Amino acid sequence: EVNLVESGGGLVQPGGSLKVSCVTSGFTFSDYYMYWVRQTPEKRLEWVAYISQGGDITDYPDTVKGRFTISRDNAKNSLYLQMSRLKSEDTAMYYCARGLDDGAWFAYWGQGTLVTVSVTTTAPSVYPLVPGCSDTSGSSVTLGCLVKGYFPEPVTVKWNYGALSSGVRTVSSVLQSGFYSLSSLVTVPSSTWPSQTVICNVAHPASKTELIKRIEPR
Amino acid sequence: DVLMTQIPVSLPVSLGDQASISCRSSQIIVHNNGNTYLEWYLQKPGQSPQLLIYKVSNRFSGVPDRFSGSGSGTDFTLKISRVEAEDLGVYYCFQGSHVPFTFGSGTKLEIKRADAAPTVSIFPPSSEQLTSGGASVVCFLNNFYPKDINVKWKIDGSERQNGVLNSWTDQDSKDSTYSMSSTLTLTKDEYERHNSYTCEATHKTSTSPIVKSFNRNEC
Numbered sequence: 001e002v003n004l005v006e007s008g009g010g011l012v013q014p015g016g017s018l019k020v021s022c023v024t025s026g027f028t029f030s031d032y033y034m035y036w037v038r039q040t041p042e043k044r045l046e047w048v049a050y051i052s053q054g055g056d057i058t059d060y061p062d063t064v065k066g067r068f069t070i071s072r073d074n075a076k077n078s079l080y081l082q083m084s085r086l087k088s089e090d091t092a093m094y095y096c097a098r099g100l101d102d103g104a105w106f107a108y109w110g111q112g113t114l115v116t117v118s119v120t121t122t123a124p125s126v127y128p129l130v131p132g133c134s135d136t137s138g139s140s141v142t143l144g145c146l147v148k149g150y151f152p153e154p155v156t157v158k159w160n161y162g163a164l165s166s167g168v169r170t171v172s173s174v175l176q177s178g179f180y181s182l183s184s185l186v187t188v189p190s191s192t193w194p195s196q197t198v199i200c201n202v203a204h205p206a207s208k209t210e211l212i213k214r215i216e217p218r
Numbered sequence: 219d220v221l222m223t224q225i226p227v228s229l230p231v232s233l234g235d236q237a238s239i240s241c242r243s244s245q246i247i248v249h250n251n252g253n254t255y256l257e258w259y260l261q262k263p264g265q266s267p268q269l270l271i272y273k274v275s276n277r278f279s280g281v282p283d284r285f286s287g288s289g290s291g292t293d294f295t296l297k298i299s300r301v302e303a304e305d306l307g308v309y310y311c312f313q314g315s316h317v318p319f320t321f322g323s324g325t326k327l328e329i330k331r332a333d334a335a336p337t338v339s340i341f342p343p344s345s346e347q348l349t350s351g352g353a354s355v356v357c358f359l360n361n362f363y364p365k366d367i368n369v370k371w372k373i374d375g376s377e378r379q380n381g382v383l384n385s386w387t388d389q390d391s392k393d394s395t396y397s398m399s400s401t402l403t404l405t406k407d408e409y410e411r412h413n414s415y416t417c418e419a420t421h422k423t424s425t426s427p428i429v430k431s432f433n434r435n436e437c
C-alpha cells in the first residue's frame with residue numbers, strides 16, 4: 001500500500017531554515033511527479049511545489065519561489081523540501097502527495113509534519129485523569145490523560161496502542177500562557193477497567209518525547 | 219493565478235439529506251483542452267485531506283456512489299445524494315489547469331441531529347501533578363448536542379472562578395455529538411485550602427443544572 005511519512009518539523013526561528021523529508025513506500029517513486037502541499041492554521045490549503053521523475057522540471061508559487069527548494073532521491077525513495085528565510089506565514093502542516101497516472105494531483109497524502117516559525121520548544125507533563133466522584137454510575141467508566149504545557153503543536157494520543165478508538169474523545173489544545181494543553185478521554189465498560197488495563201500513548205514529536213502511561217486506581 | 223470560490227462557507231445539513239457545494243473559478247480553466255483539472259477534497263477531523271473527485275466527475279477509487287461531481291466552464295458542483303454521518307468535514311476544490319494551482323476556500327459540513335444531553339464527570343487532581351507545583355481539576359461533559367453548553371465552577375460554593383479554560387471536541391463522524399471539557403487551574407496550596415469543587419453544566423436539553431462534585435479530604 002502506498003505510504004508517505006513526513007520527517008523534520010518542529011520549531012524554526014524566523015529567518016531560519018529547515019529541511020523536511022518524505023520517505024515513500026508502496027509504489028515506484030521514480031515514475032511520478034511528487035508534491036508538497038501545506039495547510040495553514042486556518043485549515044487553508046496551499047500547493048507548495050512539484051518535481052518531475054528526473055528532478056529537472058519544477059515549479060513553486062510566488063509565496064515560496066526562491067526560498068523553498070524541493071529535491072528528490074530515487075535511490076532512497078525520498079522527497080525533500082529545503083526551506084530558507086522562513087517567515088511566520090510559513091507555519092503549517094506539510095504534506096507530500098502523489099498524483100494519478102490518469103490525471104489527478106493529490107491522490108495519496110502523507111501523514112503530515114508541522115513546521116512552526118517563532119520562539120522556544122518544551123515537552124508536556126503527562127498526568128492521569130481518574131474518577132473521584134462516587135456518583136451512581138455503572139456500565140461506563142471514563143478515564144483520560146492530561147498533557148500539560150508543551151510547545152509547539154502537535155501531540156498524538158493513542159489508547160492501548162491504537163486498540164481503543166471508539167470511545168476516544170480528544171479536545172482541542174487550548175493555548176495557555178504561551179503553551180498548549182489538551183485532554184484525551186476514553187470511555188470503557190465498567191467490566192473492563194480496572195480489570196483490563198488501559199494505557200495512554202502520548203507523543204510530542206518536536207522534542208522526540210514519547211511515553212505510555214497506565215491509568216490505575218487512585 | 220485563478221482564484222477559486224466556494225459556496226457556502228458553512229453547510230449545516232441533516233442525515234439522509236441531499237447536499238450541494240459549489241465551486242466557481244475566476245475564469246474558465248481548461249488546460250491542454252483534455253478536460254479540466256478540477257477536483258474535490260474532503261478532510262475529516264484529525265485526518266489528512268482525501269481525493270474524492272478529479273477530472274470534474276471522475277470518482278477516485280474507493281469513493282462511495284453518493285458522491286457526485288459536475289460542472290463546466292467556471293461553475294462546478296458536488297452533490298452528496300444522501301448525507302451519511304461519516305461525511306462531516308471540510309470540502310475543497312482544486313484547480314490544476316493553470317499555474318499556480320489553486321485550492322478553494324473550503325466549505326464546512328455540519329450534521330444537524332436531535333438534541334442529546336451531556337454526561338458530566340469530575341476529575342480530582344493527581345498526586346503526580348501536585349508535586350509539579352500546581353493542581354488542575356477538570357470537568358468533562360460528554361456526548362451532547364448542540365455544541366452550546368455552559369460550565370460554572372464553584373469553590374465551596376462561596377464563589378466561581380476566572381482561571382478556567384474551556385475547549386470542545388470535533389463533531390463525531392458517526393455519532394454527531396460534541397464533547398467538551400472545562401479545566402480549572404489552581405496552585406497546589408490554594409487547592410489544599412478548600413473542601414468541595416463543583417461543576418454546573420447548564421445545557422438546553424435540561425432545565426436543571428447538571429452538578430458534579432468532590433470534597434478533597436476524608437479522615
Ligand SMILES: COC(=O)CCCCCCCCO[C@@H]1O[C@H](CO)[C@@H](O[C@@H]2O[C@H](CO)[C@H](O)[C@H](O)[C@H]2O[C@@H]2O[C@@H](C)[C@@H](O)[C@@H](O)[C@@H]2O)[C@H](O[C@@H]2O[C@@H](C)[C@@H](O)[C@@H](O)[C@@H]2O)[C@H]1NC(C)=O
Nearest residue numbers: 031032033050098099100101102103104105106249250314
Ligand atoms: C500506472 O502506473 C504509472 O503511472 C507508472 C508511471 C507511468 C508514467 C508515465 C508518464 C511518464 C511521464 O510522467 C508524466 O509526465 C507528464 C508531463 O510530461 C506529467 O504531466 C504534467 O504534470 C505537471 C505536474 O503537475 C503539470 O500538471 C503539467 O501540466 C502536466 O503536463 C500535461 O499533462 C501531460 C499528461 C501531457 O498532456 C502534457 O502535454 C501536459 O502539458 C504527468 O503528471 C500527471 O498528470 C498531470 C496532469 C497531473 O495530474 C499530475 O499530478 C499527474 O501525476 C506525469 N505522469 C505521472 C504518472 O507522474
